[PDB]
């Protein structure tokens, strides 16, 4: 029995016939689950069946999350979000905090259900329509609609704020030595305190949400052999930019130098104190690269000179919420991978490397995905919003396997693109 609160009017951006995305297949293991969870939502009253008559549609999928709670339903409202107009109470009710990034640890709560109580405009509903499918198509698709707030959608967190906040209101005044950020289905909470205490105080917040308007979070499982939960914790502070840029040629050859100078060139685009010319000279004239060890200590003065420039913080970072965010991933070497984020070309705000995850779980994609995820999270905590992803993988591919490893409660925007050596110059800074 949904709350008696009045309803917020939601009419997406103009000239936007809502979504019309199709439903990729899903595994048995998923259907069943997705089914169950989807069915009792109908019971409680949350969701209502509908038929063909509804033109609109979006996709959904299971996601066996490692914890005491069942799998999770997931609805790709990505496109929906795009269509729905701008909301002030969103930005307003959901502003980004700084000190946030500055803490000893941060945790993440799946606080979706909160949305389950507040209703939803009768009309705007048709724009949430989804469809569960079947093996071998025993029967046709079976579609549902959201009546209340759907778990994951711009508009959703946008409204419930009032509620969301006041609920948290006590916790803060109760001890504001911790901070909290909301992002769609998720609650970001960080305490510079000791892990255990942090973990406990976290647990407090849980119970609180419980007693308050039955806001019920997941309960991440914890065990003895390879202790994953011990790590669930999120401690940023130890988050430096990808300081991977070097060389030390004690007898630089034609290639070595040549290669490098092709590299140094590109760097001039980010950094100012760049000088490829000095070395270009040591290279001047159709020499035999092969074996030629044209050792030149004359240019050595300007070669260790660029080093100074490469060793520090690129002065220019001028973050801008009014502009979008971006990220490139690079497959630089087996195991490890790379991220760089910005809004303006060759002018990144931060960089890094998600490496191997010390597990025999060898699988290109898996990592890539994992990459974006941990990349994202990171980005969220900072400037707040979510970067677009120039994906180092071929479409058809990424598709058929990303769901199997995803684990967030949101899904960022991604696009596929080929890669040149320019950045493969280990200098991931695009």
């Amino acid at each position: 029995p949904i709350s008696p609160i009045e309803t917020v009017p939601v009419k997406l951006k103009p000239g936007m016939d809502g979504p019309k995305v199709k439903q990729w297949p899903l595994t048995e293991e998923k259907i069943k689950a997705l089914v169950e969870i989807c069915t009792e939502m109908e019971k409680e009253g949350k969701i209502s069946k509908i038929g063909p008559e509804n033109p609109y549609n979006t996709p959904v999928f299971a996601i066996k999350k490692k914890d005491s709670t069942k799998w999770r339903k997931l609805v790709d409202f990505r496109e929906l979000n795009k269509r729905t107009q701008d909301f002030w109470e969103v930005q307003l009710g959901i502003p980004h905090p700084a000190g946030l990034k500055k803490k000893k640890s941060v945790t993440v709560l799946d606080v979706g259900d909160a949305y389950f109580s507040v209703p939803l405009d009768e009309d705007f509903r048709k724009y949430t329509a989804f469809t569960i499918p079947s093996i071998n198509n025993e029967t046709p698709g079976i579609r549902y609609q959201y009546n209340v707030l759907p778990q994951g959608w711009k508009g959703s967190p946008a409204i419930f704020q009032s509620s969301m906040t006041k609920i948290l209101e006590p916790f803060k005044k109760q001890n504001p030595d911790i901070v909290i950020y909301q992002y769609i289905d998720d609650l970001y909470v960080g305490s510079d305190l000791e892990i255990g205490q942090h973990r406990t105080k976290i647990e407090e917040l849980r119970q609180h949400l419980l007693r308050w308007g039955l806001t019920t979070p997941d309960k991440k499982h914890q065990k003895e052999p390879p202790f994953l939960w011990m790590g669930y914790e999120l401690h940023p502070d130890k988050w430096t930019v990808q300081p991977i840029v070097l060389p030390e040629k004690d007898s630089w050859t034609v290639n070595d130098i040549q290669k490098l100078v092709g590299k140094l060139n590109w760097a001039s685009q980010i950094y100012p104190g760049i000088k490829v010319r000095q070395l270009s000279k040591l290279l001047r004239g159709t020499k035999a690269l092969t074996e030629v060890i044209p050792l030149t200590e004359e240019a050595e003065l300007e070669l260790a000179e660029n080093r100074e420039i490469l060793k520090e913080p690129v002065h220019g970072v001028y973050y801008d919420p009014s502009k979008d965010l971006i990220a490139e991933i690079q497959k630089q070497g087996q195991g490890q991978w790379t991220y760089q984020i910005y809004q303006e070309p060759f002018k990144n705000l931060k960089t890094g490397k998600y490496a191997r995850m010390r597990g025999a779980h060898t699988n290109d994609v898996k990592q890539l995905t994992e990459a974006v995820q941990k990349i994202t999270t990171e980005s969220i905590v900072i400037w707040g919003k979510t970067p677009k992803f120039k994906l180092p993988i071929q479409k058809e591919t990424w598709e058929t396997w990303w769901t199997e490893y995803w684990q967030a409660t949101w899904i960022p925007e991604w696009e596929f693109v080929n890669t040149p050596p320019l950045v493969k110059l280990w200098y991931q800074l695009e």
Partner: antibody
Amino acid sequence: QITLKESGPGIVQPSQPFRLTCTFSGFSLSTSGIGVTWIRQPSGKGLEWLATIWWDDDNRYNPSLKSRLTVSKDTSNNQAFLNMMTVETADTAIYYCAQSAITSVTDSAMDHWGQGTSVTVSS
Amino acid sequence: DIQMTQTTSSLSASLGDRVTISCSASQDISSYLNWYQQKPEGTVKLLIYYTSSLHSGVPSAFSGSGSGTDYSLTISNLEPEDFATYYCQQYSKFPWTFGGGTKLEIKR
């Protein structure tokens, strides 16, 4: 530093039950990676694991004992216990209680113990 | 429920001798072992976890190594406190199992 002493009967007629109590002084049985373990060292034999009481209340007993084995822990007063029923000779030994704790993502040991407790079975 | 084994039940070395002890499991355990030393006065202390991470407090003289299903405990030079039964412990498959410790008697 944290420590703990165990206590019980020392002597118990066969086919009966007994209750051993381990009183610790350092950690609490309410912290994420804490726990208390029970071990039994027989006449000359080595180290056998009876069981381990965990903070979140997830207890794991020995497959060969659970049946006639049961644990508990008055959390509030830093006291966990071991209960063994219909105790037959063999069971007669020096039981110990150790603070087990999950150090990190890859570590969990019995950081601290405490001179066991004799328990003899005999008519 | 792993099968833990300490082959060389007991040995007799002398002061300063470097000694090595062979611990064997019944399957890959992945550095999931521990080394305790029981003192003849009954006491039982923790030396090393994770098969090689030294327990804050144990003399450097002690060193961890091993892998797969075969692991090793060793000390550099002997000093009369060490002549004890040393136990090997796994924390993989919950039926945690201690192999039959190794006595470390003096040679005369």
